[PDB]
C-alpha cells in the first residue's frame, strides 16, 4: 500500500512519521522547504510542492497512491482546492483534515472519502478524563456498553478480584490488571489489585460508574 | 468540581462543550469576542478575557477552579505565560495543549501538570487505521498489549469462535461481537460471526496481527 | 425573470438596490437582521436567513429563481458551501463574488456560472483614469481599440468637429457631445464643442492619446 | 508623474499592477510583509510600512508623489488616519477607497480629492448585466442615452447592417463589430454580423432595448 | 446631565475633579491603569479603556452621556479618532482639547462642538499679568472692553471713589473693593480705598490702562 | 522690562508671542532648533540653549532679565533643575509651570516666585461652563461673590432690565449687555435683552444661580 | 547608630534586611501596606507612611536618626521632595538613590549627602565579568589599579607562585589562594595553585589582563 | 566576542556603555526611540526592536551574538518571554536581570545562564558602608576574611606602617596606600599614612574591625 501525506504539520507529520515506522512506503509532500527537510529522515521520499497546483501534483506521480492524506491546516481554501484536484485525478481514498463545520460540509460534498477532526475528537476524550479523574482511557462498544481503563485508588489496594464482586454487584467483568507496567489478561479471581494499577473493566456504562462511586 | 477552559478553539471548545453536556460548571474564556459568543450556550459562563493579564484572570475568579485547561493554540507565548500565571495562583491541575517538542519542554519545566498533543496523538491512531483497513478503533493497555475493534471480512463469515481458536492458537480473547446494531458481550465459543460485523479482540499486538493475516 | 441576491453587503446590496430600481422581482437574503431591515425598502421581499443551511434555503423557495447571486464576502466558507448547495438545487444561473485567486478556483470547479471580481475590475478602470486625468469613462472593444469619454479643455473651447479633423488626421471618430446636460448624438461637422463638456471619441488607443497630446 | 498605492488589497493591488503595466513609477506600500512580497514583481518599489505613522511615511519620501491612493479596506480608522496625514503633507491628489457612507463623509470633510466605491459601482453594472444578459459592457452618455456592447444572437446571424436598419427604424447607430477577435470600426452597410459576435450600438436607452426585443 | 471625561491628565483630571465636587455624574476614562486608580475617589465611576476602540467605548455606555470631554493630550491621532467615534455615535456635546492650530482644524471639520486651548489661553492671561504687575485677574467682555481686578498701589492709598472720578474722567466704573478679605460690592462714592487692596474696575481696555498710568 | 521665556511650548510660546505683541523685550529660549526657528518672528531674540546647562545659561546673559519663565513640560527634572539654577543666579522673578502636586511642592521649596497650573486652572473654568450651559465666562471676587457672563435664553427674550429686577429680587446687578458683537456698559433700566446676547451679572454666587433657575 | 530606610524596594529592602542582620536599629518606612508587612520581621520597626508628607515624617520622629536612606524608585518627584524635606529637619546624613543624571544633579544641589546609582554601578561590574569570564569579583583602587578574583584554568594547574613570577614579569602580586573552601592569605612562593580555585591578584588593570591572556 | 544588550535602562545602558568603552562589539536594543537614540553614541549599533517578537529579534541577527543581556525593566513577562526566545534560538550565554525572588525562579527554570540582582546586591554592599563609616569599598574572600579599603582618620595621621604594627598585632596586611590619587602598592615599612588617605587592609573581618576600633 502506498501513502501520500500532503501537509507535514502536527497532524500530517505524525501520520507520516508513524506510517514510516510501520515500514510503509510514504511520500511526504509540503510547500515549506523547512518542513520537507525535517521529515526527509521520516519518509521514503519528501518533496517540496504546492498541492493546489495540478502540474506540481501531476509531477509527483500522485495518481500512483491509493491513499492521499490532505493535512493542510491554516489555509482552508488550499485544503478544499487540493481535495477537488485529487478527486479529478481519481485517487482511490482521499482523507482530509477539517478545520470547522463548514469545511466538513464542503469536503463531504466534493467527495472526500474520510474527514477527520483531530482536535475535536481528542477534546471529547480529554473531557472524559477531566470529569472522571479515575478514567485513563476507554473505548465505546455501543450507546450503553463500554470498555474502560481505570486508575486504581487506595480503596482498591490489596483487594482481590473475587473480593471485588463486579459481575454480581455491578454486572461488569474485569479484563486486565497492569502492575508496575507488567500486564495480566483475563485475570483469575485470586489476583490482587494494588493502588496505581491500571484496571480494565467491561460492562454497561451506568454499571461501571456505580463501581467507581461505591467500589473505588 | 469546577472547570475553566481557556481558549475556545477546536480542542478547547470541544472540551468545554463536552464537559457542559455532562453537567459540570465550565467557564469559557477567550480573548476573541466572536469565540466567546459562539460557546455561550455551551458554558455556565462565557467571558472575554486575556489570559496573560494577571488582573483579568482574578476578575474571572480563577482561584476557585480545580482544573484550568489552557487550549490556546497558535500563540505559544500566551500559552506559556498563561500556564506560568496559573501556577503562581496555585491552581491544583493545569492541563495545556502543546504545539511542538520545545513547547512541551518549557511547559514541563514551568510546572504544567498535564501536557496534551491532540494532533500528534490522532496522527498515530489514524496511521494505524491507514495501514490496517480492518481496524476501526483500538485502545492500548501497554506497549505490547491492546484491545482492537475489527471489521469482519468474508473470510470470517459463518465462522465460530471455537473455529477461530484464538485463545490458544493466537493467545488472544474475543470480548464482543456487534451484529446489525445488536450487541453481544463475552460471546460463547458456539456463537457465530457474520461479515461486516464489528469484532473486539484483546491480546498482544503481534498476536492480533497474526490473527489478521492468517485468520481474516 | 426572478433574481435572488444572497449577502447584502457593498456589492450584493448595490446589485439588489439597482435591480429593484429597474422593476425586477428581487429577493434579498442576509444573515444579519440589521442588513435585512436596511434593504426592506429596496427589495420585493427581504428575509433573514443562513444560506449555508439547506432547510432555510428551501424555506425561501429559492429553487424558483433563474438567477441567484452569492455576494457573501468575508466568509469564504459560506460562499463556497452556498454556491455548492445552490448547484444541487439545479439553479440555472449562479453568480458569485470571489475573494481571492483560490476562491475563484473552487467556485469555478464547483460550478459557478459567473465569477465576479469587483475590486480587481475597478482597480483597472481607476488606474486608467489615474494615468489620464482627462478620461472620465471608457469602454474597451479590444486590446488595441477603445471608446473614451473625455473632459474638454480650453484648447478645445469653441472648436468645430471639422476643425478637429480626427477622422483623417488621427483616424478617430467623435461619437457624441454633452453640453450643460444636453446630449448630441452623431454630431454634424458644423457642431461646436465648448470647454468642460463631455467628449466621446472612438478609435485606436494609441491614436486617441495622440489626439489628447496634440489636440487638447 | 509618480504614483503611490497604500494598501495592497484586491483594489489597491489591481490599481498598482495595472499602473505598472502602463509603465508608470508606482510605489507599493503595505503593512503586511506577505502582501509586499507578492507585489514586488508588479511595482517599481515595494516597502513594508504603516501608513498611519508620520515618520514611516516620511521615510518613503511620500511628498514626492503627485497621486497617492489609499486602498486600506477593513480598517476604516487607518484609512481615515492615513488620509489625514497625507493632507498635512500637502499631497497633490488623494484618492481614497471608502468602506461605508459615514466613511465617505469623513473623507469628504478631511479633504479627500476623490472617493471610490468599487463594490457599489460594480453592483450597478452587474445588475445591468443580470437584467439583460445580452449586454457585455456599456457606457452611459446621459440619463437617457448610452453606448452598449451586445452579444449577438442567432436572430442576428448572417444579417447585414442595411438589413438591420437601426438608424431609421430604431434611431440607433452601429459603431463596431468584433468578429474572431478581429475588430471592425464604423462598419459599412454591407458588412455582415454573425452570432456570438460583439455588437456596439449607440442611441437612446429605450430604443436600444426595443432593438434587443424586436431585432435580436 | 451626565459627563464623561476621556483622558485623565492635568486638564481632564481637573475637569473631572471639579465636576465631581459640584455633585454631577462623571465617568472618568483613561487608558492608563495608574491614572484610573487615582481619580476613583474623585469620580462617580472610573474605568480603564482605550477610547479609540468602538467596542470598549460602547461597554462604557458612552451613548448615555450628554457631554463627553476628550482631554487626550500628546497623541493627536488618538484625540482625532476618539472625537470621530463620538460624532459617529451621535454624542450631543463633544469638547476636545487641542494641541496646535492644525489639530484645531481637523477637530472642527470632523464635528467637534467645542475646542479648547488651555495652555494657549493661559499664556495670554499670564502674559498680561507679567507686563502689568498691577493686574491680578481680568475678564474680557469683548475685543475692546474688560473687567479687571487690580492690586491697589500706594498712590491710591486712603483715596475716595469720588476722588477718583473714573466714571467721568476715564469712562470706567469701579465695581468692588476687597480689603483684608472683607468685600464691598458696587461701592458708594464715599467709600475709601487703602493700599494693597483688590480693586475691580470696569470699562474700555485703553481707558483702564490710562487709569493705571495716570491714576495708579 | 526684559522677559526671558525658557521652553517654547504651548504655554511658554503663547506667553512669548503675546508679550511680543505688547512691545516688550522678550528672549525666547528653547533646546529644540525647530521651536526657535518658529518663534524667531515672535521674539526680540531667539536662542537655542539647554536650560539645565549652567554655561549656556550664562551665555544668554540670563542675569539681565527681571522675569524668567520656565515653561518646560515633559521633563519635570529639567524644570526643577533650571529653576534651581536660576535662583542661585539670583534671578528677580522666576515663574515656573508645574506638572503635578509634588512638582508644585519642590518648586515652592526651592524658591520659585510664582507657580502656574494652566491646564488645572482652565479645567476648573471649563467645568463651570460644562455644569452650567448658561455661563460663558466668569471671575471670582471671593469665595462667595463673583462676576458672571451669561448667554441669554428665550425666557429672557424681549425683557427689560427693570423687568428683570435682579437688584431687588436677587440682590444682583447687571453690568453689561452684548448684542450681535455690539457692547453696552452699565446699561440703563430701559435697555432690552434678547436671546443669544451676552449678559454680565454681579453678586453672590448663590444669588446668581437663583436668577438662572427662576429668571432664565 | 540608628538608621531609617524610606522605600522598601529591591534596593531599600536589601539595605534594611542586611542592616538588621548586623543588629542595628532600623526603621522601615513605606507607603505600601504590603511592603511594610513583608519587612515586619526584618526591621526594628515597620511603619506605613508617605515620606512626602511633613506631618507624617514628624510622626515617625525621623529627626532622631543619624542616617536616612531615600530608596524611593519610580516616583522621582517623591524622592526629591522627601530628600528636600529631610534637609529641613537638619538630618546629619541623607543618602538617596538616583534615577537619572538630572535626578543626581538636583539631589546634589538640594544637599543630598550621598547619591547612589545601584544599577549603573553593577552595570559596570557585570560588563567586566562579561568581557572576562575568568574574573569572579574585583575592587578598583583607582582608575588604573585593581584587585581581581580569578577562576583558575587548566593552564594554571599545579603551578607554583615562583613559577608564575608575576611580581617582576607583570608587576602584579598574588594576595590569596582559595582551595576547596580552605583559604590561604599572603601565600609563600612555594605554595601551589590548582585549577577551579579562587585566585586573588593585585596590580595594574592592563597588566592583570596580560597575565590572563598569556599566563592562564 | 559580540554582545547584545536588550533594554537600555540604568542597568542595561551602563553595561552597554561600559562594554563599548572597552572596545567590544555591542548591539544596543530598546523599544523606546529616545533610549536607542540616547545610546547611539555609546554603542556599535543601536536598533529599535521588541525583544518579545521573534521576527524583530531575527531581523537583528541576534543568532550571531555570544552574549545577550536581558535588561527589560519591569515587565516580568517581557523579561521572561524574551529569555524564552533566546533559549529557543540556542544563544550561548543568556544573562538576565531579575525583578524579584519569583522572577529569579522562572528564569532559572527556562534556562537563564546567569541571573543578576543589581539593586539587591548593592543594598548589601552599601549597608556595609552605612554600618562602618570608615569603609569605602570591600571584597570578600570568604565568610571570615576580606580585603577592605578604609578612609584614614586623624588617629592614623603621620603614622608609619611599622608604627602601625598590623603585621603582627592584628594578623592583617596593608596592601596599598592611596595618597592624593597617587597609589602605592605593597608599601614598604617606612611608608607613612596621612589622614583622609585610602588604606587597603587585608585580614580577618573581626581583626580588621579591632584595628578600626583601636588603631583609627
Ligand atoms: N499549498 C500547500 N501545498 C502543500 N503544503 C501546504 C500548502 N499549504 C500549507 N501546507 C502545509 O500544511 C502544513 C500546515 O499545517 P498546520 O497549520 O500546522 O495544521 P496542523 O498543525 O493542525 O497539522 C504546513 O506544514 C504547510 O507547509
Ligand atoms: N492571551 C489570550 N487569552 C485568552 N485567549 C486567547 C489568548 N490568545 C489567544 N486566545 C484564544 O485561543 C484560541 C486558540 O484556538 P486555536 O489555536 O484555534 O485552537 P486549535 O489550535 O486547537 O484549533 C483563539 O480562539 C484565541 O482567541
Ligand atoms: N451564511 C450566510 N447567509 C446569508 N448571508 C450571509 C451569511 N454570512 C454572511 N452573510 C452576509 O454577507 C454580507 C457580506 O457583505 P460584505 O462582505 O461586508 O460586503 P461585500 O462582500 O459586498 O464587499 C454580510 O452583510 C452578511 O450579512
Ligand atoms: N496601517 C496600515 N498601513 C499600511 N497598510 C495597511 C494598514 N492597515 C491595513 N493595511 C493594508 O490594507 C490592505 C487591505 O486590503 P483588503 O481589505 O484585503 O482589500 P480590499 O480593501 O479590496 O478588500 C491590506 O493588504 C493591509 O495590509
Ligand atoms: N486611546 C486612549 N483611550 C483613553 N485614554 C487615553 C488614550 N490615549 C491616551 N489617553 C490618556 O490621555 C491622557 C493624556 O493626558 P496629557 O497628555 O497629560 O494631557 P495634559 O497635558 O492635559 O495633562 C493620558 O493620561 C492618557 O492616559
Ligand atoms: N533643557 C531644556 N532647555 C530649554 N528648553 C527645553 C529644555 N527641555 C525642553 N525644552 C523645551 O521646552 C518646551 C516644553 O514645552 P511642552 O513640553 O510642549 O509643554 P507645553 O506644550 O505644555 O508648554 C519644548 O518646546 C522643549 O523643546
Ligand atoms: N511617597 C512614598 N513614601 C514612601 N514610600 C514610597 C513612596 N513612593 C514609593 N515608595 C516605595 O518605594 C519603593 C520603590 O521601589 P521600586 O521602585 O519598586 O524598586 P527600586 O527600589 O529598585 O527602585 C516601593 O516599594 C514603594 O513602596
Ligand atoms: N520588548 C523590549 N525590547 C527592548 N527593550 C525593552 C522592551 N521592553 C522594555 N524595554 C526597555 O528596557 C529598559 C529597562 O527599563 P528600566 O526600568 O530602566 O531597567 P533598568 O533601569 O533596571 O535597566 C527600558 O528603558 C525599556 O525601554
Author numbering:
A (entry chain B), B (entry chain A), C (entry chain H), D (entry chain G), E (entry chain E), F (entry chain F), ...: 7 to 222
Give the text the authors published on this PDB structure.
KtrAB is a cation channel with a nucleotide-dependent RCK domain. The structure of the KtrAB complex revealed a homodimeric membrane protein (KtrB) assembled with a cytosolic RCK octameric ring, formed by the KtrA protein. KtrA binds nucleotides, ATP or ADP. ATP binding induces the adoption of a square-conformation by the octameric ring and increased K+ flux activity through KtrAB; ADP binding results in a non-square conformation and decreased flux.
A simple indicator of ring conformation is the pair of distances (L1 and L2) separating the Cα of N38 residues located in opposite subunits across a ring face. Like in the wild-type protein, the ADP-bound R16K (at 3.0 Å resolution) and R16A (at 3.7 Å resolution) rings adopt a non-square conformation. However, the ADP-bound ring conformations are different from each other and from the wild-type, with L1/L2 distances for the wild-type of 40.7/30.7 Å and for R16K of 52.0/21.9 Å. In contrast, we found a large structural variability in the non-square structures, with four different conformational groups based on Cα N38 L1/L2 distances. This indicates that there is a single well defined square or active conformation for KtrA, while the ring in the non-active (or non-square) conformation is most likely more flexible, giving rise to different ring conformations in the crystals of isolated KtrA.
